[PDB]
Amino acid sequence: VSDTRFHSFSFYELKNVTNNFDERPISVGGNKMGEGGFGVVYKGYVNNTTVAVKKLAAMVDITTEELKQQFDQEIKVMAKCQHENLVELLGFSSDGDDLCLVYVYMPNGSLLDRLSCLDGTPPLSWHMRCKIAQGAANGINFLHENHHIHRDIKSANILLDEAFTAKISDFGLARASTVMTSRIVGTTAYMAPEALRGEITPKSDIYSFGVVLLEIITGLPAVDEHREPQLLLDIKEEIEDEEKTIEDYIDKKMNDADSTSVEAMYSVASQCLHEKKNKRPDIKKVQQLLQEMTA
Numbered sequence: 001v002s003d004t005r006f007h008s009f010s011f012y013e014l015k016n017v018t019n020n021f022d023e024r025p026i027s028v029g030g031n032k033m034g035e036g037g038f039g040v041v042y043k044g045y046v047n048n049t050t051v052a053v054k055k056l057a058a059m060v061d062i063t064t065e066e067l068k069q070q071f072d073q074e075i076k077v078m079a080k081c082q083h084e085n086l087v088e089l090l091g092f093s094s095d096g097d098d099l100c101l102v103y104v105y106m107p108n109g110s111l112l113d114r115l116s117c118l119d120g121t122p123p124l125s126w127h128m129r130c131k132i133a134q135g136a137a138n139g140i141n142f143l144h145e146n147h148h149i150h151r152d153i154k155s156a157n158i159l160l161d162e163a164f165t166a167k168i169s170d171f172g173l174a175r176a177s178t179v180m181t182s183r184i185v186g187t188t189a190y191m192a193p194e195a196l197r198g199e200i201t202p203k204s205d206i207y208s209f210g211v212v213l214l215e216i217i218t219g220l221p222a223v224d225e226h227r228e229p230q231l232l233l234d235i236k237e238e239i240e241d242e243e244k245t246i247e248d249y250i251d252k253k254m255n256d257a258d259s260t261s262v263e264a265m266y267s268v269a270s271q272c273l274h275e276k277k278n279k280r281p282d283i284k285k286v287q288q289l290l291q292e293m294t295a
């Protein structure tokens with residue numbers, strides 16, 4: 001028998017509670033909160049509950065069959081994986097014109113957006129950042145403990161709930177768990193070199209998480225075409241080659257950071273970013289180092 005499943009929404013009900021998928025920003029009165037390579041995310045309100053509705057689409061010139069596959073994968077993964085640091089799927093729509101996925105609304109959006117204080121939100125404190133780093137590592141640990149590879153760890157896919165708890169999202173490319181694939185996927189600025197060459201391994205998640213930790217420490221996005229260096233991961237080299245120090249790069253929009261715990265987190269990041277996959281820590285070691293950082 002099929003057992004537990006997710007609620008099915010009417011496409012028309014989702015259309016209805018997102019104001020017909022209004023792509024205007026929330027401040028303008030619309031419903032668009034964000035977008036990615038595979039969909040646009042709309043704020044909705046169903047059953048006296050604020051929700052996030054992701055309406056899938058080919059925004060990076062993917063095929064329709066591949067998108068349907070990713071839709072199916074995320075439902076499969078979300079059915080098996082429930083944890084305090086993973087987002088929760090409320091339901092889906094597949095009857096109407098487009099595929100939709102419905103999630104618990106995350107009042108503080110994505111880590112990427114909060115690090116960029118997008119829309120005027122106040123900067124995250126060091127204390128909040130440490131909790132976020134710890135929570136995301138607990139979420140990755142749950143995934144890896146349950147033999148899942150995320151393949152797209154990045155600060156846009158770490159969402160922040162009503163308590164600024166980190167919630168990992170977007171499991172459409174997740175893989176069961178070393179093998180080599182012909183379809184290279186992910187976000188270039190976060191990807192381990194072996195992932196960039198087609199290898200599939202949880203060690204690649206660890207590298208990408210190290211980039212996220214650099215974003216947390218510095219407030220800088222992983223890539224910025226108008227910045228020198230354009231890739232954040234290249235600051236590790238400038239620090240190691242003593243052109244710079246980690247203090248030179250610490251986010252200045254923070255009044256409560258202290259050198260010891262920042263250097264402790266940078267140490268974890270540096271260990272995750274070892275470009276030899278076999279030299280990186282596993283997630284359980286990352287978790288432990290991060291717990292000791294605020295001990």
Ligand SMILES: Cc1cnc2c(NC(=O)c3cn4cc([C@]56CO[C@](C)(C5)C6)nc4nc3OC(C)C)cnn2c1
Pocket residue numbers: 026033034035041051052054087103104105106107108109110113119121159169170171
């Ligand atoms: C796979 C997947 C994708 N996305 C999601 C989401 N998203 C959201 O709930 C979400 C919520 N907010 C709230 C705000 C703000 C704007 O001004 C403020 C004061 C309110 C912050 N901005 C958001 N942005 C959101 O999403 C975007 C990052 C795409 C939930 N689950 N989920 C699962």
